[PDB]
Amino acid sequence: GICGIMALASAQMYSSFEFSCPCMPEYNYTYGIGLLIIPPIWFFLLGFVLNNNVSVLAEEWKRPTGRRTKDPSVLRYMLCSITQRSLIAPAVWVSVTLMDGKSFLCAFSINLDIEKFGNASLVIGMTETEKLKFLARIPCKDLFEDNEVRVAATRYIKCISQACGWMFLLMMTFTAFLIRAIRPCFTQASYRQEAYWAQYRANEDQLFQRTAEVHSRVLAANNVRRFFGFVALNKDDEEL
Amino acid sequence: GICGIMALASAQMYSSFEFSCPCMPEYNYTYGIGLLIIPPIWFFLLGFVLNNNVSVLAEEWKRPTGRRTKDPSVLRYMLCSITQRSLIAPAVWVSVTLMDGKSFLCAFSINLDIEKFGNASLVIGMTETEKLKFLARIPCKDLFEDNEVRVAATRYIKCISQACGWMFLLMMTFTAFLIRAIRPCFTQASYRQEAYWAQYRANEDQLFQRTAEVHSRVLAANNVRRFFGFVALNKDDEEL
Amino acid sequence: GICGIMALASAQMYSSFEFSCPCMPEYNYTYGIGLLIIPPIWFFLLGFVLNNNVSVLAEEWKRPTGRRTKDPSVLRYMLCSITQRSLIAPAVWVSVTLMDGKSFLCAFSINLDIEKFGNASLVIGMTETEKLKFLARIPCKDLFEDNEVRVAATRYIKCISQACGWMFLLMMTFTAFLIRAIRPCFTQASYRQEAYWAQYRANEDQLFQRTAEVHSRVLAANNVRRFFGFVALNKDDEEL
Amino acid sequence: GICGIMALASAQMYSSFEFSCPCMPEYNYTYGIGLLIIPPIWFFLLGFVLNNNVSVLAEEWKRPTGRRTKDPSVLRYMLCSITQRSLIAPAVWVSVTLMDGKSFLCAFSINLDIEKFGNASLVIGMTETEKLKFLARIPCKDLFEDNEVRVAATRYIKCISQACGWMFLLMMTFTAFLIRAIRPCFTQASYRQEAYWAQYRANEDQLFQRTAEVHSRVLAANNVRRFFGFVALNKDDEEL
Amino acid sequence: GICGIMALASAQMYSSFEFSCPCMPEYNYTYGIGLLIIPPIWFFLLGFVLNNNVSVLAEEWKRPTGRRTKDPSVLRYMLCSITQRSLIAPAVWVSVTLMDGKSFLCAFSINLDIEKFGNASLVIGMTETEKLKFLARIPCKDLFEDNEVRVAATRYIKCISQACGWMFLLMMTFTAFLIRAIRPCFTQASYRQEAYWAQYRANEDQLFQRTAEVHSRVLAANNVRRFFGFVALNKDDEEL
Amino acid sequence: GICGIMALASAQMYSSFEFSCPCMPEYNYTYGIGLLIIPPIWFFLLGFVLNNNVSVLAEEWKRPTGRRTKDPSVLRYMLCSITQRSLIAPAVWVSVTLMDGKSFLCAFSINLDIEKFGNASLVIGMTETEKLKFLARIPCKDLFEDNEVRVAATRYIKCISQACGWMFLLMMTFTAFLIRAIRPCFTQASYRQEAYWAQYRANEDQLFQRTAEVHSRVLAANNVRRFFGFVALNKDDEEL
Amino acid sequence: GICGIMALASAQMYSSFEFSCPCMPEYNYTYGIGLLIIPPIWFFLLGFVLNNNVSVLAEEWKRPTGRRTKDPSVLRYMLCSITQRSLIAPAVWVSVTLMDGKSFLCAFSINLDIEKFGNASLVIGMTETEKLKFLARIPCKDLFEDNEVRVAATRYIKCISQACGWMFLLMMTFTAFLIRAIRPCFTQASYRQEAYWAQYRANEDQLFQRTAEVHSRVLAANNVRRFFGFVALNKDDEEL
Amino acid sequence: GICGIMALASAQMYSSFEFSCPCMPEYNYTYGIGLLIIPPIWFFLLGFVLNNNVSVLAEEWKRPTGRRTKDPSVLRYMLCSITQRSLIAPAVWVSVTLMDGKSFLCAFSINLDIEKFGNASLVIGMTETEKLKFLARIPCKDLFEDNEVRVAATRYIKCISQACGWMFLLMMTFTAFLIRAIRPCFTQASYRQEAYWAQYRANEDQLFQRTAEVHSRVLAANNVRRFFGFVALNKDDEEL
């Protein structure tokens, strides 16, 4: 479906994105956490734009009451099904980013205790501004000279990022399991009036196709006789 | 089926997961054993969410008695078949993790006796805090300097992990062999009333499809005549 | 469609374009920003040329009123649908250029503060003309001798370029989400008179095909009898 | 069949199993011989679980006599055919393990006479505990320093393992040749009553399919008329 | 079409052409600019030769008036459509040559100011004849010894060549957009008399095919009876 | 056929067998010659087990006379055709093993005269036990230090093994040519009574299939009416 | 045909045969010339065994006269066509072996004059036994130390082997051209009585198939009625 | 056709032939020129053997006059068409050998003037026997020590060989162009009596097929009734 291709595209944009973490302390956090948050808000609003039933939902909330074709508990159902469909490409991005651990490493490596992984005399002798500037280059593979305290710290934050990646997949799946145990009682067999209005819209456009094409057959025959001096019809006269 | 693709996806997430064991003693055990346990609880609740008959099971336990369409021994059968289907992707993860031995090596390498594999003078001269910090880096391939006591200890715990991986596959298969010898007497030919209710639900939605589409044909013809000034019907009138 | 192939061609011209940033201060900005701007104006006017309904739109604005076949609110709808279709290959170019960060690096690397990334004694000792000529060669990989302040500065501007690339995709998607919530009330079911005129044009050309081909059958039979001395007709006489 | 895929899977699990023999004398024997024995007991009980006629066999032994549908010499035939089908994936594992010789090398290399292959002064000077610890690391390729007495001893036990692998294939094939010369007189044309009960079960489930689906057609038509206010039937009425 | 394959062949001849710029000052300009200009004049006259309607156009301008089958405003339309079709393979060559920048580098590298890119003492000490002979070998990769002023100058002229390559694509697309807004009023629905004459020519040749083949059937039957002494006709007599 | 796949499998087991010749004098001969002999006896008894007409042959020799369906000269013909079919996978193994010469080299390299190929002073100075232990390691490529007398002796015994491999293929083919010149007079057109009994067995099982399936149709209809309260038959009633 | 696959298999056995020429003077000639001669006698007797019309030819020469179905000049024609078909896989082996020159090099390199190719002082100083042992190792690439007189002598005998390989292909083709100019007068249109007996044998076996299968239908129906108590026939009764 | 595959096989035997030019003066010429000449005489007589109309031509020249079915000017036409078909695989060999120049280099490099290509002091100091032995090794790439006079002489004779290869293709094509301008007047429409005799032979063998197969049907029915006691005919009786 559309959410099968958006789940595949969210994992595929992560693979072709080249993570380019700055190594500065005031721009580490907003780049690292911003890349966790802002591509879900993009993949969520993409899940509204590519779901054409929000255009139907738009014009139903526009009219005043009396003309409205659904109950407000049926317009609220269209809201909830278009939402919990479009929350798969966000949550594939947030889970793939957290298992890979590049974004926790960029965002949180100015918060480390560098005593725990290696040489404490790396940092004894620098000011707190230079302390942060030493720590902030840990994600940046080709700007950090120590390879033992780099490997020990990118392993610790890739671990804690994978712990938060599994507790996220466990609270997302336990949420979606709670709505396969509750939300059928929220719909209460109103999806049939949704599916009747779905079929009513689809055939009304198709009946508009055959009627306008037949109305086109009428105008085209008069225009062709005026064209060269000849009116001509093959088995396109069978609708005429 | 769905459990053929979940058994394949559980083995495939293990291959594309990159194991990133920390090398610290307080975070070794919870990372190693947590990766044995928490992805089965995820693959189990995924086996409920992607099995739509729990949505049917949900609304049958919601109503009071008198309206309920099954016996409570038939609702309990739906519970048992949806359970013992969804226990294959857990047990493929726990068996693949135990044959590979990376998770027993992370979790249990602070428990070793380092005298048994090599140089006892590696550890004579360090405190018990530094003793654990020496032992805990055994999984971490690029943080451990000795390669003889690393190879001897990751071979010993990959062995014991494969012994526990075969005694797990033997107690899982001897359990599933006990339910192919008992559980047909637990069902007691009640699956036919389940399969009758299965066919009753499926055709009721399909008969709702043809009836609403025919009801859509009625409303679309009146709407098209009001649309441009023309009502038109091809062999879509054959249901009309 | 045509906008599926133009979105694919815009990303494909970026991959096969070889970025050749000059390293001079007066030609850095106009090359870098000009490559952000001028290939969108090309991909936009390409989206008008390859959309043949602008040729229809052209001759409808050419005639005086009384002869015109649409309302001016229907000619304005053809303008808006041909515009917001053709704005996808620009915005795929501007997003791919901003995620790659090569154009912000060319354009904005004469604006840097070189103190923030490394050796301040690189530039103490040169005039402001030579200061710019030192800084301007930062994009030019094989003209810059320092590799630490090159890697630190192309990482900082590839970051800020990716921040502007995500805030662009978020203001483009939030704009297109605002027109899936407003613009159906701007069209107001006038697309049917557009689709009736679309079908009226298409069948009028096809009826001109069959009538001129039948008129061709009349002239070809008289010409063949004058040709060798023989008039001959197979089942091409079935339209005759 | 199922035994074609289990013979292929048993050879395929051996290829993807990574043999990880410990190098200790008390854990060599139980790892080496345990890997010869315990994956046959798994592949045997897998040959019962994936053969659904044991579920039929289960409920026939459950009932008391008088109700039982076979003779006890026909239930014993179902036992013997399900056994000698399921003994192919064990015997492909035991033959592939014995031709490869890795399991005899792990299990039996503490039993060697190290005088027969090379330097006798390797072991003159160590205690019998260190004698076993020297010999036990012969399978372990990267823990043994001598390469002449390693190559001479893994060649001797890979030979004796291939001798036992051919005398196993010769006593397995001479056994199965004795049952293609005896066991047709054990069945005594009772397989026809087995095949009649096989066809009686299969069509009874299929006739339960068509009858419950027709019973589903009755309930679905009444439910659809109560659904929106319409009862509708296509050529699904042809069974109605 | 034919202009799809000529646009593909023009880009493909550029890829398989091996640019072999001389390094002399009197033959640089005519080789570099001549390769910009002369393969468009070839790809333009190839667009007339492979467009057979110029053969039709040829014999219509040959006859005197009174016999001529079109208006002179219809012969002028055939000129304009065969022209603006055949201008795509030129303009793909001129755009691909300008984005690649090899032809501006050959043609214009005797015009450079070599002070702007590097060592000014390269040229202080040579006469103006040797000055040009030094500068002219800049395109010639294996004849120029300096690699810093070579890389700085082939980057500057590949830039200015890409600036002229985008302002060419912008003045070609803005021209073709002006003729999708004007030229339908230049044709003024005379393409139907062109398409009637197109169908009149095509069926007149096909009716000449069936009539001459039937006239061939008459002569072949008389010739075969004179051949061996036998006249014979299968279902080739069905046209006879 | 079955003997096409057994000839292919016998050559394919030789390619995937890894020859692991011991280098000891008392285990050279039994490994080398045993690998020539014992895999033919396996491939021969495999040619009886996978040829189901020995199961027919088994039960015909089991009964006393008077009931027996063939003449004893027709049971002896079934013996001879099942034998000379099953002798192809042995003789492909013995020919492939003899052309490759690895088994004559293992078996017969303690029998060599080492004077004929090189340095006679290799063996002057060792006892006859050490003489055999020197000679026996000639097959073992990585245990023999001389490469001139190794290459000269494995070339001499690979020659004599290829001479015995061609005189084997010549006495096997001249034998099978003698039975295409004699054995048709041994059969004496009794294969027709074999082929009549072959067709009598095959259709008797197939007529047992249709009759038991029709008997299954009778029992399934009574069981389905007792099942839910409904007896139902589609075009499965056409045999009923 | 069969001789297309035997010509392909004879060239394919030469490619996969690994030539293993001994380097001794008494075993050079019999290995080299024996490999020219003995695989043709094998490929010739293989051309009789795989040509089933020799089994027909066998039983026609077995009977006394009066019963014999051919003339002795027609049995002699079957001999000549089965011979000159089966002489293609020999003559592809003898031509491929002679163009490759490995067998003339093994067989005839003890016959050389070593003065003609290089250092005459290689052999001045050895006895005639050591003279032959020096010369005999010329084919053996890794046993001969001189590479100039090796390359000069394996080039001379690969030449003379290719001269004998072309004069063989010229006397084989001029022979087969003499039998396409003579042997049609030897057959004298007796192949029609051969082809009538060929069709008489083939349809007699096929009519034996349909008659025995119909006789099988009679016995199977009586056996099935005695089997479970039921006689049953589908459209297998159409031959009954 | 057959001459399409022989032209492809002649070029393909040249590619897989490994040219093995001796380096001796008395065997250079006969190997080099013999390889130009003798594989055309083979590919010519192969063009007679694989053209079955020479077997027809053979038996027509065998009979005396009065019985002969063609005129002697029609038998001479069969000679000329079978000749000038079979001269394509020779002339592809002679042209491919002459463009490659290996055979002129072998044959004619004892005829060179070695003064023209390099060091004249290579040969001043050797006798005329050693002069030829120096020159004759020029084709032999790994026997000639000078690489400047080798490269200069194999370039000169590969040139003259390509000059003779183009003047051969020009005198072969100008010959075949002279027979497409003359030889249709040599045939003089006698190919129709050839094509009538071609069709008379082909249908006479096919009518012999159906008649002998029907005669086979008569004998097979009598033989089958004598076979088991049953005569049986399916739709093979439709020709009976």
PDB file of N, CA and C in Angstrom, chain D residues 200-214, chain F residues 216-217 219-225 227 230-234 236:
ATOM      1  N   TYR D 200     -11.225 -40.400   3.353  1.00  0.00           N
ATOM      2  CA  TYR D 200     -12.439 -40.114   4.113  1.00  0.00           C
ATOM      3  C   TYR D 200     -12.270 -38.881   4.978  1.00  0.00           C
ATOM      4  N   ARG D 201     -11.075 -38.678   5.525  1.00  0.00           N
ATOM      5  CA  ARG D 201     -10.835 -37.482   6.317  1.00  0.00           C
ATOM      6  C   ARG D 201     -10.764 -36.248   5.434  1.00  0.00           C
ATOM      7  N   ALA D 202     -10.129 -36.367   4.266  1.00  0.00           N
ATOM      8  CA  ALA D 202      -9.851 -35.189   3.454  1.00  0.00           C
ATOM      9  C   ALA D 202     -11.124 -34.621   2.841  1.00  0.00           C
ATOM     10  N   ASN D 203     -11.995 -35.489   2.327  1.00  0.00           N
ATOM     11  CA  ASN D 203     -13.237 -35.004   1.739  1.00  0.00           C
ATOM     12  C   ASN D 203     -14.240 -34.586   2.804  1.00  0.00           C
ATOM     13  N   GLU D 204     -14.135 -35.125   4.027  1.00  0.00           N
ATOM     14  CA  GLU D 204     -15.057 -34.712   5.081  1.00  0.00           C
ATOM     15  C   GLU D 204     -14.779 -33.284   5.519  1.00  0.00           C
ATOM     16  N   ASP D 205     -13.512 -32.870   5.478  1.00  0.00           N
ATOM     17  CA  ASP D 205     -13.187 -31.478   5.769  1.00  0.00           C
ATOM     18  C   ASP D 205     -13.597 -30.575   4.613  1.00  0.00           C
ATOM     19  N   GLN D 206     -13.454 -31.061   3.377  1.00  0.00           N
ATOM     20  CA  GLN D 206     -13.836 -30.243   2.231  1.00  0.00           C
ATOM     21  C   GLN D 206     -15.347 -30.126   2.103  1.00  0.00           C
ATOM     22  N   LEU D 207     -16.084 -31.188   2.435  1.00  0.00           N
ATOM     23  CA  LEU D 207     -17.539 -31.092   2.455  1.00  0.00           C
ATOM     24  C   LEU D 207     -18.012 -30.229   3.616  1.00  0.00           C
ATOM     25  N   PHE D 208     -17.255 -30.215   4.716  1.00  0.00           N
ATOM     26  CA  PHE D 208     -17.504 -29.242   5.770  1.00  0.00           C
ATOM     27  C   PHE D 208     -17.212 -27.823   5.309  1.00  0.00           C
ATOM     28  N   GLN D 209     -16.308 -27.647   4.342  1.00  0.00           N
ATOM     29  CA  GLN D 209     -16.037 -26.308   3.831  1.00  0.00           C
ATOM     30  C   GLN D 209     -17.218 -25.779   3.034  1.00  0.00           C
ATOM     31  N   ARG D 210     -17.729 -26.580   2.092  1.00  0.00           N
ATOM     32  CA  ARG D 210     -18.812 -26.115   1.226  1.00  0.00           C
ATOM     33  C   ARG D 210     -20.117 -25.951   1.998  1.00  0.00           C
ATOM     34  N   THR D 211     -20.362 -26.824   2.981  1.00  0.00           N
ATOM     35  CA  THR D 211     -21.592 -26.735   3.761  1.00  0.00           C
ATOM     36  C   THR D 211     -21.571 -25.552   4.717  1.00  0.00           C
ATOM     37  N   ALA D 212     -20.432 -25.288   5.362  1.00  0.00           N
ATOM     38  CA  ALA D 212     -20.364 -24.143   6.263  1.00  0.00           C
ATOM     39  C   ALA D 212     -20.358 -22.835   5.485  1.00  0.00           C
ATOM     40  N   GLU D 213     -19.772 -22.838   4.285  1.00  0.00           N
ATOM     41  CA  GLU D 213     -19.786 -21.641   3.453  1.00  0.00           C
ATOM     42  C   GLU D 213     -21.191 -21.360   2.935  1.00  0.00           C
ATOM     43  N   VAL D 214     -21.961 -22.421   2.667  1.00  0.00           N
ATOM     44  CA  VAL D 214     -23.357 -22.243   2.273  1.00  0.00           C
ATOM     45  C   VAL D 214     -24.193 -21.821   3.473  1.00  0.00           C
TER      46      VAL D 214
ATOM     47  N   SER F 216     -15.068 -42.791  -0.045  1.00  0.00           N
ATOM     48  CA  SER F 216     -14.896 -41.636   0.822  1.00  0.00           C
ATOM     49  C   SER F 216     -15.995 -40.603   0.633  1.00  0.00           C
ATOM     50  N   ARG F 217     -16.492 -40.433  -0.592  1.00  0.00           N
ATOM     51  CA  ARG F 217     -17.585 -39.499  -0.830  1.00  0.00           C
ATOM     52  C   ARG F 217     -18.856 -39.939  -0.123  1.00  0.00           C
ATOM     53  N   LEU F 219     -19.041 -41.780   2.757  1.00  0.00           N
ATOM     54  CA  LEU F 219     -18.916 -41.608   4.201  1.00  0.00           C
ATOM     55  C   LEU F 219     -18.824 -40.135   4.588  1.00  0.00           C
ATOM     56  N   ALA F 220     -18.296 -39.289   3.698  1.00  0.00           N
ATOM     57  CA  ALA F 220     -18.135 -37.877   4.034  1.00  0.00           C
ATOM     58  C   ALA F 220     -19.468 -37.147   4.010  1.00  0.00           C
ATOM     59  N   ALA F 221     -20.382 -37.569   3.132  1.00  0.00           N
ATOM     60  CA  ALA F 221     -21.691 -36.927   3.070  1.00  0.00           C
ATOM     61  C   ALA F 221     -22.532 -37.255   4.300  1.00  0.00           C
ATOM     62  N   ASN F 222     -22.460 -38.501   4.777  1.00  0.00           N
ATOM     63  CA  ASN F 222     -23.163 -38.854   6.008  1.00  0.00           C
ATOM     64  C   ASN F 222     -22.540 -38.173   7.219  1.00  0.00           C
ATOM     65  N   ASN F 223     -21.221 -37.978   7.195  1.00  0.00           N
ATOM     66  CA  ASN F 223     -20.550 -37.361   8.332  1.00  0.00           C
ATOM     67  C   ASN F 223     -20.778 -35.853   8.366  1.00  0.00           C
ATOM     68  N   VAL F 224     -20.961 -35.230   7.201  1.00  0.00           N
ATOM     69  CA  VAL F 224     -21.173 -33.787   7.167  1.00  0.00           C
ATOM     70  C   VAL F 224     -22.589 -33.442   7.608  1.00  0.00           C
ATOM     71  N   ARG F 225     -23.561 -34.298   7.275  1.00  0.00           N
ATOM     72  CA  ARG F 225     -24.934 -34.085   7.733  1.00  0.00           C
ATOM     73  C   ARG F 225     -25.031 -34.231   9.244  1.00  0.00           C
ATOM     74  N   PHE F 227     -22.490 -33.420  11.026  1.00  0.00           N
ATOM     75  CA  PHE F 227     -21.527 -32.449  11.546  1.00  0.00           C
ATOM     76  C   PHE F 227     -22.170 -31.166  12.056  1.00  0.00           C
ATOM     77  N   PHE F 230     -26.049 -30.405   8.113  1.00  0.00           N
ATOM     78  CA  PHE F 230     -26.143 -30.071   6.697  1.00  0.00           C
ATOM     79  C   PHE F 230     -25.317 -31.007   5.819  1.00  0.00           C
ATOM     80  N   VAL F 231     -25.938 -31.557   4.775  1.00  0.00           N
ATOM     81  CA  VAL F 231     -25.249 -32.355   3.767  1.00  0.00           C
ATOM     82  C   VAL F 231     -25.195 -31.543   2.482  1.00  0.00           C
ATOM     83  N   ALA F 232     -23.997 -31.400   1.916  1.00  0.00           N
ATOM     84  CA  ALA F 232     -23.807 -30.498   0.788  1.00  0.00           C
ATOM     85  C   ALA F 232     -22.802 -31.082  -0.193  1.00  0.00           C
ATOM     86  N   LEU F 233     -23.133 -30.995  -1.481  1.00  0.00           N
ATOM     87  CA  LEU F 233     -22.328 -31.557  -2.552  1.00  0.00           C
ATOM     88  C   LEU F 233     -22.352 -30.663  -3.788  1.00  0.00           C
ATOM     89  N   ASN F 234     -21.164 -30.219  -4.181  1.00  0.00           N
ATOM     90  CA  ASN F 234     -20.893 -29.550  -5.445  1.00  0.00           C
ATOM     91  C   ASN F 234     -20.740 -30.613  -6.530  1.00  0.00           C
ATOM     92  N   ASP F 236     -18.445 -32.497  -6.894  1.00  0.00           N
ATOM     93  CA  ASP F 236     -18.024 -33.725  -6.233  1.00  0.00           C
ATOM     94  C   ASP F 236     -19.153 -34.743  -6.096  1.00  0.00           C
TER      95      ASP F 236
END
